[PDB]
């Protein structure tokens, strides 16, 4: 709920135990804002951290060798973690369980440190999370309180704070200039409207926002300027697959009352809300 940072780097890790045999499946993904740049998949054949953005291919063998050595270390930790949590909650070997970890950093406009975070989850439920001061932990469970005690004694937060306020910030700053054309971009949404006659006394007006970045978007339907927070159908923002995002909203209007209705698009690249009408 706090203020947005100008930019953010985030890493997402998922381990899924596969009982029977085979090491659990491990996926690592790194984001700069809403742009993926790194991948590691245990089921993939490379067995290395791979680029998924052109501006990160610049980095030479020392970068990739280092990330590949450290991404497999993450893998190993969650292999131990998956066994620890199955012993913490006392569950059989036969069950398939999931471990999720995410950490990263935000910077303000000045590109200096603003916020850091590092959170775990077991089977979708919040487990352990590092506090906002980067000095204490929040346990969502009495089992996660055991990890809280183990980590507070080992001074784990001091090492994580070193990364969040240090390596995280400086290397995100470097990614921002290495990929200015992609990461420091603002794509204003392309907008249009469609009309579909539901029946004789009703029609649907769908308000389209396409090809925008970042993903943060607000579409709202109004009649006579009054927000129709109810009686409007909104869909979750989806990726177009080309590095831009899409969203639309629809409302059912009585025939002959279209002119009374306005759609509005609010985006980073629009200083004032953009008004959309029905005009064939």
């Amino acid at each position: 709920n706090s203020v947005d940072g100008s930019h953010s780097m985030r890493y997402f890790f998922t381990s899924v135990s596969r009982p029977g045999r085979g090491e659990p499946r491990f996926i690592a993904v790194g984001y700069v804002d809403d742009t993926q740049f790194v991948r590691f998949d245990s089921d993939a054949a490379s067995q290395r951290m791979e680029p998924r953005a052109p501006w990160i291919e610049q980095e030479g063998p020392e970068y990739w060798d280092g990330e590949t050595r450290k991404v497999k270390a993450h893998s190993q930790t969650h292999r131990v973690d998956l066994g620890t949590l199955r012993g913490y909650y006392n569950q059989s070997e036969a069950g398939s369980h999931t471990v999720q970890r995410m950490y990263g950093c935000d910077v303000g406009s000045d590109w200096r440190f603003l916020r850091g975070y590092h959170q775990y989850a077991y089977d979708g439920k919040d487990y352990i999370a590092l506090k906002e001061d980067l000095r204490s932990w929040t346990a969502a469970d009495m089992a996660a309180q055991t990890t809280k005690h183990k980590w507070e004694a080992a001074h784990v937060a001091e090492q994580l704070r070193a990364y969040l306020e240090g390596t995280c910030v400086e290397w995100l700053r470097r990614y921002l200039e290495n990929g200015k054309e992609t990461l420091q971009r603002t794509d204003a949404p392309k907008t249009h409207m469609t009309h579909h006659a539901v029946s004789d006394h009703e029609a649907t007006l769908r308000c389209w926002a396409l090809s925008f970045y970042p993903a943060e978007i607000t579409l709202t339907w109004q009649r006579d300027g009054e927000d129709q927070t109810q009686d409007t159908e909104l869909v979750e923002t989806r990726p177009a697959g080309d590095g831009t995002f899409q969203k639309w909203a629809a409302v059912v209007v009585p025939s002959g009352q279209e002119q009374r209705y306005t759609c509005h698009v609010q985006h980073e690249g629009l200083p004032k809300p953009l008004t959309l009408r029905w005009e064939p």
Binding site: Y11, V38, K70, V71, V80, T84, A154, V156
Partner: peptide
């Protein structure tokens, strides 16, 4: 770049 240091639960 990802963090260098990992710790177990």
């Amino acid at each position: 770049k990802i963090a260098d240091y990992n710790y177990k639960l």
